[PDB]
Amino acid sequence: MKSFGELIYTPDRAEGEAISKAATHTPKIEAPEKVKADQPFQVRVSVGPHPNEAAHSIRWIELYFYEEGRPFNPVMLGRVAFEPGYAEPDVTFTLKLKKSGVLYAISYCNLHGLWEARKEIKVE
Amino acid sequence: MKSFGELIYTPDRAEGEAISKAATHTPKIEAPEKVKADQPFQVRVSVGPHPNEAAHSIRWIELYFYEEGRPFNPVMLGRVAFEPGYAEPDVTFTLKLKKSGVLYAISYCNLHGLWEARKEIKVE
Amino acid sequence: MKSFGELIYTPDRAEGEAISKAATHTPKIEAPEKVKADQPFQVRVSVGPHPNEAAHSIRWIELYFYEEGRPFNPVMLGRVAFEPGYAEPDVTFTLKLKKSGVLYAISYCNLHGLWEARKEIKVE
Amino acid sequence: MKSFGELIYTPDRAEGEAISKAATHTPKIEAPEKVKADQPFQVRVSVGPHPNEAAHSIRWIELYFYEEGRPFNPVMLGRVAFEPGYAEPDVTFTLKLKKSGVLYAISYCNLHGLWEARKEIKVE
Ligand SMILES: [Fe+3]
Numbered sequence A, B, C, D: 001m002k003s004f005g006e007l008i009y010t011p012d013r014a015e016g017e018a019i020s021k022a023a024t025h026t027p028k029i030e031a032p033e034k035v036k037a038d039q040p041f042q043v044r045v046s047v048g049p050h051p052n053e054a055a056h057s058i059r060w061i062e063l064y065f066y067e068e069g070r071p072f073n074p075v076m077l078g079r080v081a082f083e084p085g086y087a088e089p090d091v092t093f094t095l096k097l098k099k100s101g102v103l104y105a106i107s108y109c110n111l112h113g114l115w116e117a118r119k120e121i122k123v124e
């Protein structure tokens, strides 16, 4: 059968119905290309436009980081959950990185599954 | 035998050793005084300056709202959990309100407990 | 003005509509009266009978512990979030304690707010 | 680069150093082979034996369900977070399923990443 990782939707592997839903469920990551080690910087993650109702909303977003050279990966960075109708899926985190790697954002829609975006960040 | 509600630290209630910790644990809420119904606005919540390590950090922040004329209260708005060492306890949410009320922020430090801050918001 | 801890419903201090909603929202805790320090035991926490739909369900349960002699309190033990329609608000945790104290259970219903129950635990 | 789904450890795909960590990080799912639609039943999920310290513990477990015939998948069932040193990674949920599918448990160790187990459940 399918492993969990095969189930996560990405825009470049979108198939069938999923294709039409990619633009409004794939997280958008706004982050600098380059940061200094140990220095705080902001990352904004937003999803949509998308409905926001009890029956249908982006429920949460999780952020992970693949850190270069780590014996195991990834490192979870944060998780934010949004109450339907009150909080929009658009959030700004403050992060400190130590080493270059890859930032992953995963959002969940209760109807339309798990969607992944990723962005490389260089740490100098 | 205290109720759970009595355990929550308010800087306006700080007795004992709680006094000294209050500045570095009490959430700061930045939000407008007045917003328009159903119009998205941003709320920044930050705690610090505070240690950020596995043994000691702000683990999470929860946002609640007391909505005026709501038969039961409060309403949870959202929740963010931070990874020790990687995410700083400084987050911006995007919210939508329909009725005036009081915005509550609760931060948790694994060593130092629950800290409440509040702000009134008016909805036009 | 109202502080956050004042908003939490106790069957203790339930009045008004909060009286009639109390039986179906207040957490029921099954735990031993006495446990050996650092020895794992089980705590079952359940809420109901209660609706379980997108529009209306028990969204989560948080477990806190007031540890006797800790300079700050409480300590969160765990948190469980339930998906509407699929997971019932009935959960068993495995805990281990080092000192006697008071166990707190907090459930959240999206329409009916926060509900507290508590149980003293002795540790030998 | 690497997609997030490719990062999740499974015992059959364990490469190198991760092979030796598999027994103590892969979730163990105890669940019935067969249930009736809409009828509650228990699923126990545990991980280990594993250390449980601030510096190193199973931080959380998430449960998802691949539901047969659903246009998108999977459905998140629930999530449980454990406070290090206090809650062991051994939890029992109560679930109601509506249609046959595959149950997934994902646990996270702060040092050793994300691990997956899966179990097929028939719903009649
Ligand atoms: Fe959707």
Ligand SMILES: [Fe+3]
Residues within 6 Å of the ligand: B025, B050, B056, B057, B109, B111, B112
């Ligand atoms: Fe602290």
Ligand SMILES: [Fe+3]
Residues within 6 Å of the ligand: C025, C050, C056, C057, C109, C110, C111, C112
């Ligand atoms: Fe209710």
Ligand SMILES: [Fe+3]
Residues within 6 Å of the ligand: D025, D050, D056, D057, D109, D111, D112
């Ligand atoms: Fe480990």
